[PDB]
């Protein structure tokens, strides 16, 4: 039971469901010492049972409204584990991740297969921990806490910051995910090329594999962190390392549309 | 029916008052039992509702103050053809009631909203998913607080182990307790005013280490 921005309280459905059980337990306790007849005691023990059923798996008998006001079932212990939304598919078999971004994709004709366009401002925040370090070895900040306060407001961005960001990214690669993520090649590791402007520049041949077009298609970026995660990305995951389909043995990156026509 | 208690709970709480009445009933009075039972049933149900109908629980006297506040607001709506001001109710609620009191009562009467309240017509989103966790320190915060104990341990090396220990003991960096000067005098072998003197000179040597180095400054917040 927490206080939101407005000061108001927001409580979990499990709390009105536990207070229901507690109440029927503590009235059942009172009735039995008061020596109630068997027709009342029958009743109170039956209700103690649809409190335990509402709590554990609700909707397996009839569904408790939080109040008559919302006909929304109170979300119970079972409801929380099972579902698309359940604790399992939502939380344990996939997560929201820390270093990641999203943008609109735009055609990449110039970049080499293994490369892709990354807007300045995305690359800044994605590598922000690495950049605060690189700002310390080069002189642009006394330390981290100073360097961080320097990047907080947008007029405070120095030219050396940028020329230092280039120093960070060297050799590293990132992952591009267009969803639907249908098969393995729907996430490919590219080496980023910092570009001005606000969108991502995708390489033409991999467009077909991702089922990307630019109708306004958007793609997510993730940053592999460990010196391990890097090796994985750059060796196996690279866009230029997977040129055939795992599905049939046939070439996945093939001359596509303008390119077939050109030739 | 609709007051925050389920039917069966209202019946059970009512039954509990039927029992109170069976023990209090004097048959010599010519009244039929139904007359006397009715009073105790209505009393135990109203106690019950006022007790159990709120997630954030409110005292019984306080409950009916808020209720009286509601009915008075409602009456004033019926009269004014619109919802009343805090001050319009405060008048109608008689002496001792100002706008400030009518307001604070209302805020105290605010019931909590389920975190599972759906967002959008799709089943996909919940309210409590958009609610951040303010308690547990973000990675930034935890990183900063460590770089603080590192920066304080680097600037306490410039002091001798005695004068740095006067400070380490007195502000609670060790064990989490702040010791009075007589205690740092009992541990070191110095008199209480001598440990106030080597605490002041060590704090002063720190001030020069800071004005010269420009390290601890960024922690100004």
């Amino acid at each position: 039971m927490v206080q939101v921005d407005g000061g108001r309280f927001a409580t979990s459905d499990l709390n009105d469901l536990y207070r229901r059980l507690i109440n029927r337990n503590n009235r059942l306790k009172k009735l039995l010492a008061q020596g109630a007849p068997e027709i009342i005691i029958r009743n109170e023990k039956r209700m103690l049972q649809e409190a335990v059923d509402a709590l554990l798996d609700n909707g397996r008998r009839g569904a408790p409204v939080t109040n008559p006001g919302s006909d929304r079932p109170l979300r119970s212990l079972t409801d929380i584990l099972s579902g698309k939304q359940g604790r399992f598919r939502q939380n344990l078999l996939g997560k929201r991740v820390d270093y990641s971004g999203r943008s609109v994709i735009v055609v990449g004709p110039q970049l080499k297969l293994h490369q892709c366009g990354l807007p300045k401002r995305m690359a800044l925040e994605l590598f922000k921990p690495f950049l605060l370090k690189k700002m310390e070895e080069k002189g642009i900040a006394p330390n981290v806490k100073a360097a961080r306060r320097m990047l907080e407001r947008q007029r405070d961005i120095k030219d050396e910051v940028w020329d230092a960001l280039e120093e960070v990214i060297h050799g590293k690669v990132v992952l591009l995910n267009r969803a639907p993520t249908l098969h393995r090649l729907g996430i490919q590791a590219f080496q980023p090329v910092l570009v001005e402007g606000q969108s991502i520049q995708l390489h033409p041949l991999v467009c077909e594999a991702f089922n990307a077009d630019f109708d306004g298609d958007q793609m997510a970026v993730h940053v592999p962190l460990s010196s391990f995660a890097q090796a994985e990305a750059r060796i196996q995951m690279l866009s230029a390392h997977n040129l055939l389909s795992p599905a049939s043995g046939e070439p996945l990156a093939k001359p596509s549309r303008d390119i077939i026509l050109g030739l | 029916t609709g007051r925050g208690l389920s039917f069966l709970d209202l019946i059970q709480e009512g039954n509990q008052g039927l029992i109170r009445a069976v023990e209090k009933f004097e048959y010599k009075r010519r009244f039929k039992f139904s007359t006397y039972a009715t009073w105790w049933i209505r009393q135990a149900i109203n106690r019950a509702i006022a007790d159990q109908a709120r997630t954030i629980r409110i005292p019984v006297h306080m409950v009916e103050t808020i209720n009286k506040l509601s009915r008075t607001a409602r009456q004033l709506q019926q009269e004014l053809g619109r919802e009343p001001t805090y001050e319009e109710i405060a008048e109608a609620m008689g002496p001792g009631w100002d706008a400030k009191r009518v307001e604070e009562t209302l805020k105290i009467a605010q019931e909590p909203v389920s975190l599972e309240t759906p967002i959008g017509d799709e089943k996909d989103s919940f309210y409590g998913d958009f609610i951040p966790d303010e308690h547990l320190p973000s990675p930034v915060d935890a990183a900063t607080q460590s770089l603080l104990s590192e920066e304080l341990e680097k600037a306490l090396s410039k002091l001798s182990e005695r004068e740095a220990m006067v400070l380490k003991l007195r502000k609670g960096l060790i064990d989490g307790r702040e010791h009075t000067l007589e205690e740092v005098g009992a541990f070191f072998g110095v008199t209480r005013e001598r440990i106030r003197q080597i605490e002041n000179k060590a704090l002063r040597k720190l001030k020069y280490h800071e004005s010269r180095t420009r390290k601890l400054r960024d922690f100004l917040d």
Binding site: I39, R42, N43, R46, E50 | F7, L8
Partner: peptide, 14 residues
């Protein structure tokens, strides 16, 4: 099922 309905009939026995 329907505990209201069943309780009522349990009450209607007396």
């Amino acid at each position: 099922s329907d505990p209201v309905r069943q309780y009522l009939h349990e009450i209607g026995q007396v």
